[model samples]
Target chain A: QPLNEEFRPEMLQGKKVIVTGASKGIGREMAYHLAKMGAHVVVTARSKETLQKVVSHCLELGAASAHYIAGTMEDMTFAEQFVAQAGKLMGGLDMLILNHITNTSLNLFHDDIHHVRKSMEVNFLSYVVLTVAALPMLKQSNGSIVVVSSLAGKVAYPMVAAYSASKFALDGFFSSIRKEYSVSRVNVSITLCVLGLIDTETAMKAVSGIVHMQAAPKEECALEIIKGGALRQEEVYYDSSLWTTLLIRNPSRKILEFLYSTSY
Target chain B: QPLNEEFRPEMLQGKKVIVTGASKGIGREMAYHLAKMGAHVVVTARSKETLQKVVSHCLELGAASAHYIAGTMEDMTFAEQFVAQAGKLMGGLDMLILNHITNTSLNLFHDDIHHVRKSMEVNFLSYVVLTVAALPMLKQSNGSIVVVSSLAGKVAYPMVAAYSASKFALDGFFSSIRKEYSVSRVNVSITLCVLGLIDTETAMKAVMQAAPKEECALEIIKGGALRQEEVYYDSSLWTTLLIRNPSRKILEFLYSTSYNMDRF
Candidate 1:
């Protein structure tokens, strides 16, 4: 259960992998790590310019093959099509790292149905669409799915209503699918990465003054995510602090009551 | 954490309430219970004939007032409009019980993006849209929002991939909003009822045998009246207790046992 095994770069050698939201943050760093491990990498994001730079860097980092698909996942059609395109480009697929999410603003639930719908489309439904499209290729290769989730997804957090909802949807959708794959004798593995406060620019700007928790480095977090996926772990908690572990492992009524009373 | 107190019908006397999916099943029973308690009730469903019958029954059962808004929640606009209409008819809203769900069919993830999107719209996004529209009235009244969920929302069940996903989305969306209400000192309460197999005609046929729908309906209403954060019925509590604190080893054990895998 504990991820104590050493994950050398060679473990991923020649593996065909696709990483979404790979232009920046933990996603961008994951692309670098996969490429350095000599994996055939295909990355996607909204900004073509940023994706091109990341792909160029991947090639420079000794990738077996590196490619980029530039498009937003908000379009459901694009979400499904990108998977097939990536599968063809890579010749096949070994792993899928679904990491794209829309930029979020923390707001109270004040008639913001539009934001919630957009979050579901971009963050939740897109994951399901892409994964459905990629299932065939993944089943053929006995591949793995790495769903990048957040502590917000697991526990109820204030101020990020839409963002938290979308993340929770991912946990529900993929966790069920993981069971289905197992029952049907399909060899696809699912690894859900439960990330804490990582020192990403977007995250920092959002929570710098409000949240007092220390953030783990993005580079280390990215590496652990890749290792967790490659190892086919059911869940990997980043920044495994005592508090984070307790919060996850102890789903007690006392804790719920405490959160109700104290947490803002 | 336990709902030990007995609920007398008079507890709901003179309360304004909105019950969705009240044409039949648990939602229908809940409307009757509220009416028996002398509550003002407004109910909605896709079938105008069914909803009218339900409303007439509520009025005959001694409801302070009864109305029906018949429409499908497939359209987001309708979801919002229904809430506003209910609020206007009731003069204000005190309780909003969301229980509508699309019919589910068992299917594997065979690139069914259409099904997934449809499920999200009807089951998940509609909840958000309706809640958002009712915020002003709810805030004015210090209301309670009751989200009728299922065991499928708490854990991944096979075959009903889209159903499970949408249910999970409900947990995420409502749970987070519950905390937000607490933090902002909003008087609105959110209660999520975790239901197990029930003996509704539709459910009985699908599941073969299940718990009584009347008992399930009573428990759901009592939990909502108490403003509990979550309510687990019968065997669902066990599922919640088990899944609430899952370790990787335990998860693998579950996966392996489900698939008859040789090794953990």
Candidate 2:
């Protein structure tokens, strides 16, 4: 139950991992953590120089091997091919952490439908496309999937409509697959991470003028996610107590009601 | 609280209504039921002769008006124009029930991606485009948008991947809008009806051969529709209960472990 002891480094002792959005922020931290845990880590992002620095650091930190691929995940070919190439290079993959996102704009509602569309492509559709391409391999390896999401996905706030939409889409798509695999007794695990504020430079900057909440450190968040993959935990939740209550409650309709009605 | 009784009828009464795929299924029953409750019902499908008879019967049952749109929901311009035309005929607007779908396929997973795509455009996106265009007038009338969905939206079944995907997509997109209105405090009630197997002609046919249980229909199904509440009835017993008593262990640790490798 409590993720405190259940998720530790040995959980990924010999696994091969692919983490997108790995140039900086939480992606960078995840690469470092997975590498230190004795897994072969393949990191990808848009910036080559930054990715190389991360790969070099991962090697020094006792990784089985570390490599970097610098290109936008916006390229559909790259998303599918990158994973295939990683499977060949690392011999196989046991986990996929889809954490990439496109740049966003904080504009008024009427002015932001395009941003909403773009976000859907990068944040949500890519996840679906990649997951489809990865299924054969994942089925072969009995691999686990981890999608990094935000508390905003479950709750709502201002100016984050595009981001929130994509997160919500991921929840719907992956949650269904989770039920499917469970029914067929398929071994592949689908885990979704729900995080509140985290100490990522990007997240902090995004909320600098707005957020009053404290963010958990990246190390704790990373470990919790790894535990979910290894143990096949359904949801890896940060802001533990807050989400603990959320998890047990049949909050679907309540969530729908709360969001649609103004008086609440 | 349940849906407010005060808004039930002329919230729809004397208002023009259109339901596509309205032959002999949920759509047919919805047309009959809405007509009983004092709506001007317009039913549509490929069967002009069937549409003509249904219109006559609806009139006999006391619809303020009853006619058929009679083509398909896949045509965006036609669907968009249908809403605009409905507004003109009714002299204003009140409720839009997006309940059109095609369900004649068996192999929804293998070799039927195109079938899924076609049905998705008809079932989901048309509703979206129609809804977007209807927003201005619906907002003027303080309208309610009720989306007819299924347990398929909430869970996955192997043989109906495309159907499940469309339903899932509907839940996400509409739910996001549902939340948007809340933060903005907009006066619109968007109720998503997620049901299990109904004893209706179409749904029953889909699962009849495989299911072990005999079917039954309860008035609560229509109660949910008329009241416009997020609901489940009859065969949705397990699903409704899960919504109330979700497994906390699975929900809480859901994502924490699998995304451990996403930290970087």
Candidate 3:
């Protein structure tokens, strides 16, 4: 089903965009939606075959241009280079959506120090590396950097300590930089998408019988992420549960920040 | 000025505790406070010379036992092993105070992925490693884990991207586990301390319009001794007023029962 058009679809037409972790799930769904909007899209993931299939589908969806780069975000060097190379594919970039994550499962944190380090590396550190590499192009085009996060990032949840740490790190790094941009007049916007469980195959399989909450559709989740970035909103909160939707938006935090910093 | 009595200092008397980054700043001050409370204290940091001075002062201040081990948090091996050695030195542990951080300066993030990674390694990851090592000791005594952080971790701050990211990661990681412990029937308490600028030589070189390190240290100790989940000590009343984040507490409660712990 087509999304309710809140803004003109032409807002994304010919917009040069990059979406990481696009091989499957919400990232893949986002690529398809961007393609349908006639945006030039560059997608990335570790699986070459799956990435190529996604790119092929984008072309069929009437994308202005479509490309894919397959590599692991675990390599910081590759993360840096991916941006420079992706920018060259499209003349300039209007949006850079960071969505990749190291695979994680719900488990109690014990002596798994390695998993914690890997999560920080692949989930959080690489996002900063990509942002640094893309800043020049983003600065040139007055672009937006959208960070994909989780409901776990905002509130406490058992069995996801490492993943939650990385997602929370994303909020800290990007939100701090967002303030820097405002003060420095850099004109680049940052959007942090705090999502509840989405009905992605990987997500469904991971949770299995451990969790009982309803999952939001991945397709709509992707669209909300894109819309928030396109509209330059600071945050996007999506969940199947109405209670969670109300609870996740932190009004007290905003009040504290407003009083701390004398500005809107 | 002496702090008002919230919890009796005798609450920590004869308690075995470990404090990191004790060579200077708030860590050094905290060691002294623990000493005054007659706690057995093991202090760790990179510089042996300064650590020795801190150890000497702690003993003079009336610690039941005082020792110092010098090692860099950047070394995961050192971080992991130090806890074991410290636990052995005291025969057991009652509290683990994770307070170490890499030396950082205020600068806008621009192409410094190394600093960001280093910040996470030193400020965040090592803390997790240390916690894992200390968990067994804490569980046996039904003790506390106190994480020292900043207001920058809670709200957006300019010129401290890497620093804020690590601090925010601490909150998310520990906060999530706080929930896990609740359901698993683990009695160990976790306290996250969010502090503003302190009158330390290190911080005065970089920041704020003033809070005393002595008072701040005492507050963190009191919170842990009382087994509180969070402690806030900022320079402003308004900053303090809204920092509790009631929404997060409400949501975590609502969703705590949503997970099937029986899956374990």
Candidate 4:
């Protein structure tokens, strides 16, 4: 695990990658980074025009190949279909990036059961559907899955309960399977990104002056997440301050996981 | 905080409570324990006959008042409706016990999207629907919401990935709101119960190791009655001990200092 042996741009060159929520924010930045690395990229989101624009940018960035599949992840059938079609477009998939999230604003929860259900579906459940669809191709290539999550996923935060649940679900589902793959000898790696507030237009507008913490740059956050996947790291925590990462780290679970894993 | 301040059976006497997944197993055991202690109890499940039988047994066990509502938590409408009706049946609500889970077996995941979605709906989303429906009555009575989770929710487990995600999602959803409630001056308590495999008919058939269902049921009830933040039960005492994360407590507290909210 020498720094010299770590991720290189050449590692992802010509790699086929699927990046969801690629219309804007960190997801868009990730696609551009992968594209700049000369990777074959398939990007998805609800806006056909936005996805087309992203694909155009990817091609301009010197991607091996760039494709756009504009559709909602809310539909499970669409999720499955997108993967198969994207797989065909790229011939196969080496990396699956689940980064799509529903629009959320800072506010106290009220009688909105609708928001909770939709958040779970858009942010959490569809990721599972996409993972299932992409698993075969990922397993075939010994590739990685990079799940975009938030700091709220790890610890408690106000006004984002519904959003946090979906993010937490991603960790639980993917991490459990990460362990399963270890014992089952499946070569696919799952990397969970625990990101704090980022300076994305969508996010900055939501927090504005309400939240006092500084936002991390989305570009660096995207690059770090891609590097985490390329390095096959289990988790990557990116926050504005190192102290946030220190405080959020669950050493208790880390110890217990080791003990339980050994005992099992 | 002290041994002298521990929960007593008298604390539950005459309290109105609703327990879901109560047709059989640990839910049935919890209903019976509550009944014998003279609690007004409303139990729910998918089976009418089994529910009727449980209600009959509760009456025989000297429940202050006992009723059964038969329905599936899979339907959000039913989940919301059941809580309101159960609230009205008891004249008020003191505690909401969410224990029902989809049937599961320990197997390495492959290509089953159905199970993942179903588990999230039945185990996680429905609980939120029920919580929303019960909150008005619960807030009026200063009640507690007890969410039953699993060891799989806390750490990585080989098999139980779908179930674990739902459970972990429950923790994230509830714990965030727990902090929100503190700031909002909402006097309701949320207790998340992290339990290991129990000696229930369904669980015994699914998992190899086991803990006593009867004892586990009582602990869940006790935790709610005591207004405890969490209740952990496992066959291994060490596992239970290791589950508590004080770092999460400190982290949440630290983050709260910087959070200047206008709404709450």
Candidate 5:
């Protein structure tokens, strides 16, 4: 089944875009791709030096325009500013990509559950705050909103409980709002990406010791995201090598039981 | 694949059961079924007189014992005290059913959004508080917990945002805990009853106005609770009806889009 016949590169040529967590990983790749495809891309990450490098790379790749903002998403004010600043830089916004998340590892969990709270603030709350800020601009452009979550959000996996919970919360929040304006003409596209193991710096480090499996390249996952958003698709599943074996193989089952060994 | 048939009704037998909004409707039906099975049911409602009457009815119907805790779930102290008194009277606990909720009209946002928060505290947070207070007893008894959530929590529908969000949060907290104790013998069976439009008193009222009603009842739906009550309803329509519903765009968004929460 073919979809969106006209959905190809430069589909967003005239659009202004914001990509958070753009210093590295899928966020960085998305910033690179959107800019390469002729959109004005505003990239933000906490590290000024890394963000500048990403912006430079985007410009070198022939981006229509590229800008970078450096700050954490912990402050709701900063989250609001990320959207406003992107809108201001590009004159108006066409897409808002919420990918920025605080850095933490699952290895530290034998010590404290409070750490989970911190991850929730960064990975979950920031998405909500940014979306609240981006809604007005999205309405103006009849634009799309992208949330770069993980497959971990949808399934309960061991070792990444806190990280997974935050992703799950993100799933809950945006998916709810998607229905809030279902009948409205506000073409607000909320895409929830559920990606399998991907070879990114953080992901590689986290899983390298625990998993001896292959992962899809982060760049390939990024391209899928871009393609799905360009066509306003609601959800995109990336790197099915594992999802194929786990989630897809059991299409009839409602709950993901393999991850948890309970008396079923 | 049929799952192992484990015979365990002490999950309810001789258990101190607290059911809210228990005067009539589905609440009354749930109390009747739980009591008929073997529970020492403690029913609650805003009207003391009505609750006592319901308790008398339960005793006549063959409950091991029956009692009443009359108050408002909206009142946090009252809600807390109600659970506390139930705890004191029962001497211990086995299961908790947070079944009470406020009513909202179909497809209409008549109340303030703040009402969502207030109702959430009443319907969702108080449930959490009561569960937290009962945890020691539950842990002691290796008790199970059932959260009577809905399909609304699983998917979006109009005019039910507040109800949906509260149900969604129930999954968040309890599911998190369920995953937490997967390896332990905590015996916490978090039964999330994902119901369709059940033909309840409220649904009957809405049906008068041509609202979509599924009419799944406490009795007809009881098979699901007794069967695979972990996260589904007995109605095959939900799983069957939505099977061929072409959600290509949603699939694309989940797999390929950067706009989703997958990146986290």
Candidate 6:
């Protein structure tokens, strides 16, 4: 879904939004989309130099306002502080888009318990910390939380055990919270973007030869996430053929066995 | 799926097993069953005094050997050390049953995220730490890993956000490793036990009208011994069927039908 097709630009006009992992990849593209829609956008990433360029470009794209928070989410203190600082920058938060992730590659569980713990800290715990910090602002504005997840979180795949576990943790945490919000009549909409392969440099490098499926464009993926957040859909499955989402719901009995037969 | 109906006591004769959360509830009962079958068992729990009594009961029940290591799973250091110490005590490990969990209650996601992080550490990360530490011994014995998870992990429900997230993390981590082990010909089996409400002091206090823990314990051991990748118990069987049906209408019906506010 393109930003111009289904959603009018005025829908986000003057809206305060925060997009994490905005230095490059899908997050960078999402920053551009929010900016073009005239939203007050606050972006975050580890690279200060790259975030500078992204924030300038967001301003050029007609954002109502643009700011950047340069820090690593690996630090729990940074994660919490970033949200408070971003909320201050944007006045009040209307939407929080969590899209940052650590670099992951195919590998077996070779007793690297430390690496797995690191993955949980960066990819999972930070999300919870940031969301908690942003909760008050979000509650006041009746905001939304857009979680950028993956197909691996829903269905198990070979290799990338640590990465998959973190994503799966996101699904579990967010999905449960979604229900809690509904039951308690808390006006927060959580949209989980369950994505398959996308043609981002990082993702392509991770699964080039092993996965034969076509990768969707990162630009389109970003727009889809924004639309899902705005529309308040519980989940958005971004795949060319819509097979991954269906596969997760009704996975073949021998799928794991079949995956096991493959040479990783 | 009964103890005597499908399994021979000789199946566990001289087998080496480690069970977490063995101070009370299902974990306590699982220890008794393994001991009665003459398995050399190592049990862990938070209460030293309670574990002492359980270990004594196991020895009286004709355990080949029984030992207890009492400590909280909240600490990663304790989790890793317990595995190493258990491996040394048992000589080598044959089965790892991860059943420990923190106390959870129904609550809204009103930004109590510090509690969520604590939940992940105690209920989820500790499992990874212990399993990784025991991988070598398990590889040597071609052992099985039985993860005593809940139906909450499979389907989303209101409240208990942290608990569900941790259980879901278990499914993702273990499921991925299961495939990795199978693909690499590691000869390690991972069995995930998806249980419904069971009659235990903890569970009964949390929910009304539950299945007997004795039956649940018997089924868990049977599935673990059989090396099934996944097993569903009681109402969970229907939830599993609904989730796999691939029809959104049926799934909505399933959610509306199976949501139990009293149970986590």
Q: Quick one: best lDDT, which candidate?
A: 3
The 10-residue segment of model 6 chain A with minimum total lDDT is A255-264
TM-score of chain A of each: 0.90, 0.88, 0.96, 0.97, 0.89, 0.90
Q: Write the per-residue lDDT of candidate 6 for residues A1-264, one digit (tens) a residue.
A: 112346656778889999999898999999999999999999999999999999999999999999998999889899999999998888899999999998777677777777888888888889988988888899999888999998778766657788888888888788778767765778888988888778998877866655556688999999989988887777888876564455445343223213322311
What are the Cα lDDT values of the candidates?
0.81, 0.66, 0.90, 0.89, 0.66, 0.81
Position A89, candidate 2: lDDT: 79
- lDDT (10s digit) by residue, model 3, range A180-241: 88788898889999999999999999998888889999999999899888888899999998
Of candidate 1 chain A, the 10-residue stretch with the lowest lDDT total is A255-264
Better of 2 and 5 by TM-score: 2
TM-score, chain B, each candidate: 0.87, 0.79, 0.96, 0.96, 0.77, 0.87
Ranking by TM-score: 3, 4, 1, 6, 2, 5
Which residue segments of model 6 deviate by more than 4 Å?
A: A1-6, A245-264, B1-6, B235-237, B243-264
Model 5 whole-model lDDT (C-alpha atoms): 0.66
* Two-chain complex of model 5, DockQ on C-alpha atoms against the true structure: 0.11
Stretches of candidate 3 exceeding 4 Å from the true structure: A1-6, B1-6
Chain A, model 6: TM: 0.90
Better of 4 and 6 by lDDT: 4
- Over 4 Å off, model 5: A1-3, A45-62, A68-78, A102-126, A158-182, A208-213, A240-264, B1-13, B20-25, B36-38, B43-85, B101-133, B159-162, B165-180, B203-231, B234-264
Q: Give one digit per residue, the lDDT tens place, for model 4 in A17-67.
A: 999999999999999999999999999999999889999999999999999
DockQ of each: 0.30, 0.13, 0.73, 0.73, 0.11, 0.28
